[PDB]
Coordinates of C-alpha atoms and ligand atoms in Angstrom, one line a residue:
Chain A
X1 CA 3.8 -8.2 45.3
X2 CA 1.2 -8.0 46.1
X3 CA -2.6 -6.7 44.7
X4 CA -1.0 -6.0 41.5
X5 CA 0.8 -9.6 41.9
X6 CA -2.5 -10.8 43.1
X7 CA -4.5 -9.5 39.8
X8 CA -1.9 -10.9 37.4
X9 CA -2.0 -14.6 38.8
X10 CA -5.9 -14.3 39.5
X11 CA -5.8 -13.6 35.6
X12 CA -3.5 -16.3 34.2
X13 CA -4.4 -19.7 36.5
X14 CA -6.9 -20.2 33.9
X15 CA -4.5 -21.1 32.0
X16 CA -2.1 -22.6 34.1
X17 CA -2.9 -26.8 32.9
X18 CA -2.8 -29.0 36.2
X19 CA 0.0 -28.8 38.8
X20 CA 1.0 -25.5 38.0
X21 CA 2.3 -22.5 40.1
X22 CA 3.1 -18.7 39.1
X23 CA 6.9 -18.3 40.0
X24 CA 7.0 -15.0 39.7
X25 CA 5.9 -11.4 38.3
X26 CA 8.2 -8.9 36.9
X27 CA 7.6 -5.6 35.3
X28 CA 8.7 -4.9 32.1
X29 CA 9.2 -1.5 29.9
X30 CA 7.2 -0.3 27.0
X31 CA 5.7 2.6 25.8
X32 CA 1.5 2.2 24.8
X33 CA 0.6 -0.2 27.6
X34 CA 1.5 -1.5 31.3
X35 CA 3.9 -4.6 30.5
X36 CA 4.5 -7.8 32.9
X37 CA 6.3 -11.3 32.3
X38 CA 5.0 -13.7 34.3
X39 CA 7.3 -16.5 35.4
X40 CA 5.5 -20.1 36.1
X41 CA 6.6 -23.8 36.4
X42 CA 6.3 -24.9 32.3
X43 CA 6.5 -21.4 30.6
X44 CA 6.7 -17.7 30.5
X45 CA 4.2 -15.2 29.9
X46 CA 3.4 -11.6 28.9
X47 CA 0.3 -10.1 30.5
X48 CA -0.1 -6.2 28.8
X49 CA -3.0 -4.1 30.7
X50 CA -4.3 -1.3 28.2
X51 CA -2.5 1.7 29.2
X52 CA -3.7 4.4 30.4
X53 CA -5.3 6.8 27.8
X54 CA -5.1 4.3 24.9
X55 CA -9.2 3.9 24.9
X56 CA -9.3 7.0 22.8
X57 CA -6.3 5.6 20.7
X58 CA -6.9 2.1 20.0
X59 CA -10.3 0.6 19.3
X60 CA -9.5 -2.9 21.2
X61 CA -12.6 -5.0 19.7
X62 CA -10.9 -4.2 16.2
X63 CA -7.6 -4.7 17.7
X64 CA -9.2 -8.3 18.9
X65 CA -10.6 -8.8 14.9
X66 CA -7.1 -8.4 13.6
X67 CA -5.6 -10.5 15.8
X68 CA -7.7 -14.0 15.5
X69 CA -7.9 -12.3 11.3
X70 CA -4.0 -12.4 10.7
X71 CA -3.1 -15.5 12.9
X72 CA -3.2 -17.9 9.4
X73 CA 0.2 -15.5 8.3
X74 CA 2.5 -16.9 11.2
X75 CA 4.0 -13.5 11.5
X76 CA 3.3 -12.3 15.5
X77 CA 3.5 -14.9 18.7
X78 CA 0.5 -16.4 20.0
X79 CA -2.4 -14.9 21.9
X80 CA -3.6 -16.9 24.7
X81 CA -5.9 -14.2 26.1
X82 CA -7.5 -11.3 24.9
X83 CA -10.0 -10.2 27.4
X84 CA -11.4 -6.5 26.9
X85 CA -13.6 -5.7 29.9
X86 CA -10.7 -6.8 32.3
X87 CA -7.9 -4.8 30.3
X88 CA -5.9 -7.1 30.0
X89 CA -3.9 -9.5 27.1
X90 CA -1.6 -12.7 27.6
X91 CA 0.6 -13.2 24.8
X92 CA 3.6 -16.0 24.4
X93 CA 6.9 -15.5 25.6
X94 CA 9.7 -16.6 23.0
X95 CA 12.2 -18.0 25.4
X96 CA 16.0 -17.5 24.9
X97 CA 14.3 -15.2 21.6
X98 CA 16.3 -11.8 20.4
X99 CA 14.7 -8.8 20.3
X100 CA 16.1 -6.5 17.1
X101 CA 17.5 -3.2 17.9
X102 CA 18.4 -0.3 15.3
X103 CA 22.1 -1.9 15.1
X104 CA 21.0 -5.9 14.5
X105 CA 18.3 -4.7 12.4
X106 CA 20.4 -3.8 9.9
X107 CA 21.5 -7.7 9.2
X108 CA 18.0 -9.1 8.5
X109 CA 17.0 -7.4 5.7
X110 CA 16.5 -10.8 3.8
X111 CA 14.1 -12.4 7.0
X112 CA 12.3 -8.9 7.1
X113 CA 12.0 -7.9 3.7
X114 CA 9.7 -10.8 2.9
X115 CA 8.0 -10.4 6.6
X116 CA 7.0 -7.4 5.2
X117 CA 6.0 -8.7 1.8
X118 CA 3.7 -11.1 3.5
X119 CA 1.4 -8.5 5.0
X120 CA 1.2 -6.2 2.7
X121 CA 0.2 -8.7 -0.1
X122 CA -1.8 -10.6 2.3
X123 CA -5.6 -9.1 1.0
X124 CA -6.3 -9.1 4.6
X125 CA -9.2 -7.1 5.2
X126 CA -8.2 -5.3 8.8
X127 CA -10.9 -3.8 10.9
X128 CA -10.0 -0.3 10.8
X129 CA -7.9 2.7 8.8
X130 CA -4.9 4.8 9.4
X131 CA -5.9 8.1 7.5
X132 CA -2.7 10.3 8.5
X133 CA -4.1 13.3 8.5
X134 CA -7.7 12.1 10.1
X135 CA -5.0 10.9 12.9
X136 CA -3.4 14.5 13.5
X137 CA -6.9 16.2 14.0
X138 CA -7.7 13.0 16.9
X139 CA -4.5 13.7 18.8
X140 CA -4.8 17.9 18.6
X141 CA -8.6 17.3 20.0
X142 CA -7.7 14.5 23.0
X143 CA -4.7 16.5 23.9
X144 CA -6.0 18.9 26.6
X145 CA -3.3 21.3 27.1
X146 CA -1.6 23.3 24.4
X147 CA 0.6 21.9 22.3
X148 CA 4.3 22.5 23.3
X149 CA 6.0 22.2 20.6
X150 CA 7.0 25.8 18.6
X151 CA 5.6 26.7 15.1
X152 CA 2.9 24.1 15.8
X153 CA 0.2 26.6 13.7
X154 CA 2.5 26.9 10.6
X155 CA 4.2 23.4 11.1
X156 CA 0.5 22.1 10.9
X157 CA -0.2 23.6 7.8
X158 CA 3.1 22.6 6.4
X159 CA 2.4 18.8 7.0
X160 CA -1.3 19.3 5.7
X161 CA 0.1 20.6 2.3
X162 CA 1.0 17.0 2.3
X163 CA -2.0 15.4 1.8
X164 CA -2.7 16.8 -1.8
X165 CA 0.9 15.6 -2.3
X166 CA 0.1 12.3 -1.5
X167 CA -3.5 12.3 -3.7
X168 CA -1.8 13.1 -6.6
X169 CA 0.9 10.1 -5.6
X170 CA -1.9 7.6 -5.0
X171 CA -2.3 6.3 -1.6
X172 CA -2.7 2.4 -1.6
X173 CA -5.2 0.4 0.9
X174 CA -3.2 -2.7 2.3
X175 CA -3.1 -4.5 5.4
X176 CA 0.4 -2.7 7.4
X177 CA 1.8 -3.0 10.9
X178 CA 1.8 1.1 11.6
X179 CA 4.4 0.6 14.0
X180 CA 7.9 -0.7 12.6
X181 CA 9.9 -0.4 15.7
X182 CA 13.2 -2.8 15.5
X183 CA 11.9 -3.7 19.2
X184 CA 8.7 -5.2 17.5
X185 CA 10.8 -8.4 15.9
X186 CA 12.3 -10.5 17.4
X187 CA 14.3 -13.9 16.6
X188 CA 13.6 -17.4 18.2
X189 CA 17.1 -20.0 18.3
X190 CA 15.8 -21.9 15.5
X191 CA 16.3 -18.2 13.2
X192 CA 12.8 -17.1 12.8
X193 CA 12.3 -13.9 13.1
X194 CA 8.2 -12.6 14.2
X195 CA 7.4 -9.7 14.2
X196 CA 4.7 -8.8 17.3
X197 CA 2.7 -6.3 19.0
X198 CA 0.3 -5.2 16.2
X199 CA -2.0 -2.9 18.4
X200 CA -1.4 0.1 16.0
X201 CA -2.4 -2.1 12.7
X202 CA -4.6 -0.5 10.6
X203 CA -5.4 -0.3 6.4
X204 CA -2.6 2.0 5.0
X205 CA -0.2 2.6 1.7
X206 CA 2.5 0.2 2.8
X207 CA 5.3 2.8 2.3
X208 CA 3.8 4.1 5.7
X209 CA 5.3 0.8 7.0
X210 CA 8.6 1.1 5.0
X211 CA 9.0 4.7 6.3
X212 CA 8.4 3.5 10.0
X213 CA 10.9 0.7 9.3
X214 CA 13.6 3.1 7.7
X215 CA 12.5 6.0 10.3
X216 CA 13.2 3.7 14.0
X217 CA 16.3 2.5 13.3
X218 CA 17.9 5.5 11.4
X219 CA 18.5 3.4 8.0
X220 CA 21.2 5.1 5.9
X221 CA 20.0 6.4 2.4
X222 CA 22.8 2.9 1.4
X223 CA 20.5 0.8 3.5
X224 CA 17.3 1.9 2.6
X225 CA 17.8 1.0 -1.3
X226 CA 20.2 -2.0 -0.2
X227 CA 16.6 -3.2 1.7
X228 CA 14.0 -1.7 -1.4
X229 CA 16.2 -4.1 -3.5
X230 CA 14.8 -7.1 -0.8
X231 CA 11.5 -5.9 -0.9
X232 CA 10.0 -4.4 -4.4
X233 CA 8.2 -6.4 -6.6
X234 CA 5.7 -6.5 -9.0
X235 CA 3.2 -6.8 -6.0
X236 CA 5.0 -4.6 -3.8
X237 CA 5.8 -1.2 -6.0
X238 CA 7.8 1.3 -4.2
X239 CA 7.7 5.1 -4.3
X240 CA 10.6 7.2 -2.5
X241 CA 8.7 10.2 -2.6
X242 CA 6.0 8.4 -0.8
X243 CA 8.7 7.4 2.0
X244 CA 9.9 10.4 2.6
X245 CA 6.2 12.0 3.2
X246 CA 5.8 9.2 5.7
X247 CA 8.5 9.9 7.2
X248 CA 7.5 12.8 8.2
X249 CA 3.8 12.3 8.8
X250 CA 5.2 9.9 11.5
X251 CA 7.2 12.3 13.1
X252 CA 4.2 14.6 13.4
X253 CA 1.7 11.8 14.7
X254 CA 4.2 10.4 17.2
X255 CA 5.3 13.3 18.5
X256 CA 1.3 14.1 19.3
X257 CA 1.1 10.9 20.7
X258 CA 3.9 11.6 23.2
X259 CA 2.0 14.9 24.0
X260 CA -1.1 12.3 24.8
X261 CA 0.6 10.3 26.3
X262 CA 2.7 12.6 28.8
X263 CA -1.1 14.0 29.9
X264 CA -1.9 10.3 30.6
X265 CA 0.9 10.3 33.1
X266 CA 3.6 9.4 31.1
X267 CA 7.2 10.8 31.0
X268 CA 9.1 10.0 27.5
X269 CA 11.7 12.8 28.3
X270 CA 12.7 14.5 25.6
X271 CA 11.0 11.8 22.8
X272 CA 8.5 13.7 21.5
X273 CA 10.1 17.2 21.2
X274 CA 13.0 15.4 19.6
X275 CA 10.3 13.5 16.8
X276 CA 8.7 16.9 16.5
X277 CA 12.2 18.6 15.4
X278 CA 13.0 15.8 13.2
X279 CA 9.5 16.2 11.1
X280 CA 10.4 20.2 10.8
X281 CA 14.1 19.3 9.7
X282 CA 12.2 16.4 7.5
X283 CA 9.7 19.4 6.0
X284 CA 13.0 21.5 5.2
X285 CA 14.9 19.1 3.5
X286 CA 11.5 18.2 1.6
X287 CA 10.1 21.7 0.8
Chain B
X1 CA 24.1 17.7 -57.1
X2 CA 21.7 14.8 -58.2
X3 CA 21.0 15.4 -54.2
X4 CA 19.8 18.7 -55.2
X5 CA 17.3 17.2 -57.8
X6 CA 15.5 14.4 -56.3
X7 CA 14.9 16.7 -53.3
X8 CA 13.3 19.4 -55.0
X9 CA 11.7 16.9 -57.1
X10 CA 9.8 15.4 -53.5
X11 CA 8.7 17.9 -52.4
X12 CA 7.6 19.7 -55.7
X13 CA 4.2 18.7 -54.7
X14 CA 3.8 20.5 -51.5
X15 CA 4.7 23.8 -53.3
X16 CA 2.5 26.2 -55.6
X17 CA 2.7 28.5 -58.5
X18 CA 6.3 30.2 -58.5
X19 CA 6.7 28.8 -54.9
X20 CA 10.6 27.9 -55.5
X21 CA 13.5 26.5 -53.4
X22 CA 16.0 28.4 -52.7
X23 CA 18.3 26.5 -51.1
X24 CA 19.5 22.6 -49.5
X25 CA 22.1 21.8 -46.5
X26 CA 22.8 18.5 -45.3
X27 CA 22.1 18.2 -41.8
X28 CA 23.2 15.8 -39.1
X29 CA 21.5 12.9 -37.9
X30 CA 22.3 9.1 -36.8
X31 CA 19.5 7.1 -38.1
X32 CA 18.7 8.8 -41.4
X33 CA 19.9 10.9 -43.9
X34 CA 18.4 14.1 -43.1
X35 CA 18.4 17.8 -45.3
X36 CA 17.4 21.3 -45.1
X37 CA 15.0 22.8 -47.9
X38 CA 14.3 26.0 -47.7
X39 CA 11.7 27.5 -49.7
X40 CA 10.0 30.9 -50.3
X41 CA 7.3 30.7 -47.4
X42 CA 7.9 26.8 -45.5
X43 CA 11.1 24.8 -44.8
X44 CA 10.8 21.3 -44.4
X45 CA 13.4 18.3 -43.3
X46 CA 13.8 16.1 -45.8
X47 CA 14.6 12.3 -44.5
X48 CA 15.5 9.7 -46.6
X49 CA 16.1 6.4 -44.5
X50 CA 19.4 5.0 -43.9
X51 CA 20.7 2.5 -45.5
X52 CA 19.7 -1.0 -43.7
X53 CA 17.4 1.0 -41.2
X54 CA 14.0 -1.5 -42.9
X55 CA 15.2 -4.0 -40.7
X56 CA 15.7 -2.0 -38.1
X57 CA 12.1 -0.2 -38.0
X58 CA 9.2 -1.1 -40.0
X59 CA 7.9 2.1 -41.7
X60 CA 4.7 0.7 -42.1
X61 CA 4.0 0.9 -38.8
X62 CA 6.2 3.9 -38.2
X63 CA 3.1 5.4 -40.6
X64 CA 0.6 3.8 -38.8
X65 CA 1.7 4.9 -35.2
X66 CA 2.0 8.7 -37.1
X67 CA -1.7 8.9 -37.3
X68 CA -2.4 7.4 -34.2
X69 CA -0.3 9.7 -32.1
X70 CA -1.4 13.1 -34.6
X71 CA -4.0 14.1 -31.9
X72 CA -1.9 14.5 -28.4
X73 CA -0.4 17.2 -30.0
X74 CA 3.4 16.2 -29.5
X75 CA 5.0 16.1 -32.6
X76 CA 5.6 18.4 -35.7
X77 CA 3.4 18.3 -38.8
X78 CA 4.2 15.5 -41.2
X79 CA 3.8 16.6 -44.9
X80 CA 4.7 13.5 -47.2
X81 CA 5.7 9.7 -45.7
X82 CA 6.6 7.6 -48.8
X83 CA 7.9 3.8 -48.1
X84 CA 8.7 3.2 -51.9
X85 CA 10.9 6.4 -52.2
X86 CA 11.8 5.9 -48.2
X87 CA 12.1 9.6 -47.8
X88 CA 9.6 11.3 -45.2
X89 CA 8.9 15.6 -45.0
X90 CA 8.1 17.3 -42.2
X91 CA 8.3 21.0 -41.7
X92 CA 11.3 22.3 -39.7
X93 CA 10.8 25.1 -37.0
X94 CA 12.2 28.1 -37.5
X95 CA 14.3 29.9 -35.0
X96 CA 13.2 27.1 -32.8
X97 CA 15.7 25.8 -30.0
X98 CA 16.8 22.5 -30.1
X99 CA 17.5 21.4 -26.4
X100 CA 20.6 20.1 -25.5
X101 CA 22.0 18.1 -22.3
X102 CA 22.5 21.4 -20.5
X103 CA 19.3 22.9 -21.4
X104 CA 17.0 20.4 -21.0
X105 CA 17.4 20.7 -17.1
X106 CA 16.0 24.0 -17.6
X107 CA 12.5 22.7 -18.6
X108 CA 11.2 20.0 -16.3
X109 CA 7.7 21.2 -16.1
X110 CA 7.6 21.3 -19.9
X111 CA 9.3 17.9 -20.0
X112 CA 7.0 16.1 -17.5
X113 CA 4.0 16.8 -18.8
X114 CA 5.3 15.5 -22.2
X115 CA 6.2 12.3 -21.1
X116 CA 2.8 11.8 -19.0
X117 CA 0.9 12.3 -22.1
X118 CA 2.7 9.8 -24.2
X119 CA 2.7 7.0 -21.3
X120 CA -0.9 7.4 -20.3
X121 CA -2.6 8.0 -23.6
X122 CA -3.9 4.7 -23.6
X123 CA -2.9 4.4 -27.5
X124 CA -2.2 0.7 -28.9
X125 CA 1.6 1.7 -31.1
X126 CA 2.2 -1.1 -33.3
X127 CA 5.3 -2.8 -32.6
X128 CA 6.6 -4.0 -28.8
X129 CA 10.4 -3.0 -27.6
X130 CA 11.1 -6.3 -25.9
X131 CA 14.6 -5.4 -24.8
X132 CA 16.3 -8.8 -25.1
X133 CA 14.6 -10.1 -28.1
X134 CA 15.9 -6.2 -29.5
X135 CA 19.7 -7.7 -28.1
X136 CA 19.1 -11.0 -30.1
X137 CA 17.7 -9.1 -33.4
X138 CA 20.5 -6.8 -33.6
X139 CA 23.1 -10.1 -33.2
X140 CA 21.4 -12.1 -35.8
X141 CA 21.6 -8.9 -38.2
X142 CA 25.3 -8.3 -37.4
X143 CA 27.1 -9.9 -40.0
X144 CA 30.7 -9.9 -38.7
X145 CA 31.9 -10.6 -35.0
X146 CA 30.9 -8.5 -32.1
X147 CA 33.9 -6.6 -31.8
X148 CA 33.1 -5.4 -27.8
X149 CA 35.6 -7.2 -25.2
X150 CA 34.1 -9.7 -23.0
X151 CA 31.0 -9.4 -24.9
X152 CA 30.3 -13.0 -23.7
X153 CA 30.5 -12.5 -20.1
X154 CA 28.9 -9.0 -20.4
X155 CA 25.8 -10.3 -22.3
X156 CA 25.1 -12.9 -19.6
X157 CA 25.2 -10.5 -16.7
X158 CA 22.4 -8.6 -19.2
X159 CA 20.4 -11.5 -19.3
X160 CA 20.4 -12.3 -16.2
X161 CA 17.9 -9.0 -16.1
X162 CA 15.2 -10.4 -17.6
X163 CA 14.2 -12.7 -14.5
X164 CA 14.7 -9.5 -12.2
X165 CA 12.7 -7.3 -14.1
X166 CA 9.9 -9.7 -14.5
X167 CA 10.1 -9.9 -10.4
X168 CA 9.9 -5.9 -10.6
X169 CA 6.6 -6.3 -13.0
X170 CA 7.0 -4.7 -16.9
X171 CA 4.9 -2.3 -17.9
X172 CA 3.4 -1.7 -21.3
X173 CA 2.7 1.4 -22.7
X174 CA 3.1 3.8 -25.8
X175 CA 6.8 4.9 -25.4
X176 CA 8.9 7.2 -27.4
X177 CA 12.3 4.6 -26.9
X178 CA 14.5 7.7 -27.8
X179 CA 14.7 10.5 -25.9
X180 CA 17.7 12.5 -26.4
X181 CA 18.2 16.3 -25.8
X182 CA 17.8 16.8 -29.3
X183 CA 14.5 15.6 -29.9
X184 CA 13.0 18.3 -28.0
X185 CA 12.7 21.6 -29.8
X186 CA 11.4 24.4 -28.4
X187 CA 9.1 27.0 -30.5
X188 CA 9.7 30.8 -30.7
X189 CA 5.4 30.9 -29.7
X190 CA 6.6 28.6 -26.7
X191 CA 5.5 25.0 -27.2
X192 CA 8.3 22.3 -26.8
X193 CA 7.4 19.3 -29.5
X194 CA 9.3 16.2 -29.1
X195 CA 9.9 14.8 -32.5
X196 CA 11.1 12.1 -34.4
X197 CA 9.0 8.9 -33.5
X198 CA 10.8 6.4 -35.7
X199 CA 11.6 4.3 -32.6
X200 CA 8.7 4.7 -30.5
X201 CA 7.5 1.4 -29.7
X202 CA 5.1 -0.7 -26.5
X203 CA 7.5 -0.5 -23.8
X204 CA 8.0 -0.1 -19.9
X205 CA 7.7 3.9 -19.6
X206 CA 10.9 3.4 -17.0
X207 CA 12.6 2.8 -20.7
X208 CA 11.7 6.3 -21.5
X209 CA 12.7 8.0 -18.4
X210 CA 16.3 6.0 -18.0
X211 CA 16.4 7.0 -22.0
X212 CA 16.1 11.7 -20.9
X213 CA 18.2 10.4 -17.8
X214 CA 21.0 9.0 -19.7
X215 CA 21.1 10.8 -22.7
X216 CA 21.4 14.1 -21.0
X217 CA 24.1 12.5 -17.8
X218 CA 21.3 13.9 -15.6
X219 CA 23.1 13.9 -11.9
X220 CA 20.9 11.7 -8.9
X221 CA 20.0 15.3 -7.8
X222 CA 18.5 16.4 -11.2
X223 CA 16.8 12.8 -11.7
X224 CA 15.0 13.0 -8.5
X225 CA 13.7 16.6 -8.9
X226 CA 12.5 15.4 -12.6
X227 CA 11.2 12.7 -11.1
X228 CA 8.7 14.5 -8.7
X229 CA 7.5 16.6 -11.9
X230 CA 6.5 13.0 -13.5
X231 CA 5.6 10.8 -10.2
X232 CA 1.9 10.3 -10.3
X233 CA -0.9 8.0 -9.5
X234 CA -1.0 7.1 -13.1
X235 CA 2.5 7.3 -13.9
X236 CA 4.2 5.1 -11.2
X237 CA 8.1 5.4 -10.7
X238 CA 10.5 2.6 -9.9
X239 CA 14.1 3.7 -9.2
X240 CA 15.7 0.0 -10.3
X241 CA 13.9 -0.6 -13.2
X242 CA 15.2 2.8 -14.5
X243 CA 18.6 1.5 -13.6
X244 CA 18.5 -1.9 -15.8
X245 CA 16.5 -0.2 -18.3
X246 CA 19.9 2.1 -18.8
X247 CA 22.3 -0.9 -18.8
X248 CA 19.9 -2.1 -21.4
X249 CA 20.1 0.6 -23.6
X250 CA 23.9 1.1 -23.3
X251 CA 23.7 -2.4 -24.2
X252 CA 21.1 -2.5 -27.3
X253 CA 22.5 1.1 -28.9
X254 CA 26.1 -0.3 -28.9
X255 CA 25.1 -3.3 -31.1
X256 CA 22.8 -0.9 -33.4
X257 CA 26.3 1.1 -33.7
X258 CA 28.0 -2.4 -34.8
X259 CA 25.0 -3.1 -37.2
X260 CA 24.9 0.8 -38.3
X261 CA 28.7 0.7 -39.1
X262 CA 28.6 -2.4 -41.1
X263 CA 26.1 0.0 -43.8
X264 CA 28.9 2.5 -43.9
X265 CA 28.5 4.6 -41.2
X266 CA 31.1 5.9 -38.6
X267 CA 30.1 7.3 -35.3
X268 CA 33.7 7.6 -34.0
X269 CA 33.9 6.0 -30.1
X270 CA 30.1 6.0 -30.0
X271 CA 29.5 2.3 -30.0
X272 CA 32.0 1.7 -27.7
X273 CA 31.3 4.1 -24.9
X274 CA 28.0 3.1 -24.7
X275 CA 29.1 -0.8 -24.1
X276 CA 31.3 0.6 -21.6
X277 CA 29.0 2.4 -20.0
X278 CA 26.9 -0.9 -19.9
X279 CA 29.9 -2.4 -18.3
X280 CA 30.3 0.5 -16.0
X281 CA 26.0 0.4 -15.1
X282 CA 26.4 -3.9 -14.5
X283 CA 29.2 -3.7 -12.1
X284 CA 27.6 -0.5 -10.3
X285 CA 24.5 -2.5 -9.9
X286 CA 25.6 -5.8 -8.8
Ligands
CHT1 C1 4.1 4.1 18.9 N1 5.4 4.7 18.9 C2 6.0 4.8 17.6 C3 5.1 6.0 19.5 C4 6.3 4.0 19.8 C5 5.5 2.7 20.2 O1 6.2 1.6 19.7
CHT2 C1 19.1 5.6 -31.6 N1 20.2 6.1 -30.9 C2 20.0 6.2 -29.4 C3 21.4 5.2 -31.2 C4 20.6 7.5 -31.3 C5 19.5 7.9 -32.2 O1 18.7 9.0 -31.7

């Protein structure tokens, strides 16, 4: 216990049917928000408070549009409560469900691929755009401090030499996740695989979501076109080039994040530095 | 030579007053039979069709799509196109370079620009390349047996293409079909033309890039670097379709060396390298 104890059950009684008690209240880890499982007599929860900072990050009332918006696909675990004055969200808990890592990841390229094909074909309309570049400048004006990381000035322009890149590309409009971590699917007994937490989703080209895939779990160049082979179609064209610049966006944006983030009272230890170094070694190899 | 005569005799027209030739070579070629006049202020290539090439291309349209594609600028000028004598005359480039699988690496950013032209200029080419209605042409006009091994087995794993690239989506666009190294030529004044439209066709425009790729034996490295010369918003890029699109040229090529041997021709190990190499492209992709 206890207050924080105290605030989680005085949050999810409501939805605890008749003759039923909270067991108990764990914490759990995770990186945007403050993450609990609570234990009761039928079920299992997951309570997530809005973590600290993520006000300026994530515009929750659009975050609350996609939700109830994308819950016809069957792709993310139901939402019992999304309450936005109080903080706080209640999710289902997948019991005896696996979560993916980057090593398990790699044998479920044939439940992911059309996961993937789902939403980014899906025409959903999302409240809300993830304009790369637009999301550099937010993260250089919330973080307070300097930046830390060395070369920023020139790395910065570097990355922004990007963006006419990717004009001349084409940059596609399509619902995406934004956040491709192999921790975000997980498998239920029965096989099928969701894929949850989509409080980064935003209107993107979907080879953002194919570099974020590729990028967390270190795909080998083998695996990458084993997996393209899965996904392309017709309705979802592929660019490498577009990957690659993706990839390194990410690496940038992330590694801001982290910089946010660490202000906010977080300590990722050497996770954003280490992001930061991969987008200059990514640069290098591009340029 | 009566060779001598009749090609002095075509292209009597195009000359004046005491204009004269002064001299004919034989040049190389695989489709046509192709020859060098030279004359006392133009030289001109002389092509006379091959022998059994009308079921092969229709010149009519060959004609049309001439006039159509005049205005992008890509080809040389075309002086005389006669169906009835099936000979065509276009003026040959002096000192120009004709590119070659090394040097054609050299000029990318000539290249690229090229082949974006050609793919988005929107122009309606009569004639469509359907690659596996091409495979069944070519076998109906083969009179003998297929003499490649396996050719059963091997033509079923290529058909089995057709349902994956209609999953990747097919493209149609004005396409060149032909691209070898030797089709670019290079002016002294500095303009590249790519020449000798015969083939050019509606097609995917992945046709055309796995056509330069393979041609040439561009390596992974030198396709990529091409390819971000050519990637663009209106000139989309899909590795695998540039893969089956050079299984199905190995494939389609080998059978017009069948059919083009069977009219007299002999292009050595040609026909059967390039079925190989079909072989060689289906197990590397399966
Ligand atoms: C959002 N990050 C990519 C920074 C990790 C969160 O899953
Ligand atoms: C048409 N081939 C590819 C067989 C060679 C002619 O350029």
């Amino acid at each position: 216990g206890s207050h924080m104890e105290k605030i989680i059950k005085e949050k999810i009684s409501s939805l605890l049917s008749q003759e039923e008690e909270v067991l108990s209240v764990e914490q759990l880890g995770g990186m945007t928000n403050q993450n609990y499982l609570a234990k009761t007599t039928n079920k299992q929860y997951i309570v997530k408070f809005f973590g600290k900072g993520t006000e300026k990050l994530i515009n929750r009332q659009d975050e609350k549009y996609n939700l109830e918006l994308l819950k016809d696909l069957g792709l993310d675990v139901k939402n019992y409560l999304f309450d936005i004055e109080a903080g706080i969200k209640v999710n289902e808990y997948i019991e005896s469900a696996i979560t993916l890592d980057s090593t398990s990841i790699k044998t479920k390229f044939d439940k992911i691929a059309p996961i993937l094909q789902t939403i980014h074909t899906s025409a959903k309309e999302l409240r809300g755009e993830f304009a790369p570049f637009e999301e550099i400048k937010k993260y250089e004006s919330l973080i307070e401090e300097q930046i830390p990381y060395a070369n920023y000035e020139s790395v910065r322009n570097a990355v922004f030499s990007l963006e006419k890149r990717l004009a001349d590309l084409g940059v596609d409009r399509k619902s995406c996740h934004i956040d491709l971590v192999p921790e975000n699917f997980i498998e239920s007994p029965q096989g099928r695989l969701y894929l949850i937490d989509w409080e980064y989703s935003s209107m993107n080209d979907p080879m953002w979501d194919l570099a974020a895939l590729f990028l967390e779990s270190e795909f080998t160049s083998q695996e990458e076109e084993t997996f393209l082979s899965h996904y392309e179609s017709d309705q979802t064209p592929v660019s490498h080039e577009k990957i690659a610049i993706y990839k390194i966006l990410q690496d940038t944006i992330w590694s801001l994040w982290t910089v946010y983030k660490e202000e906010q009272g977080e300590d990722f230890g050497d996770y954003g530095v280490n992001r930061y170094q991969r987008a200059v070694k990514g640069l290098a190899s591009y340029g």
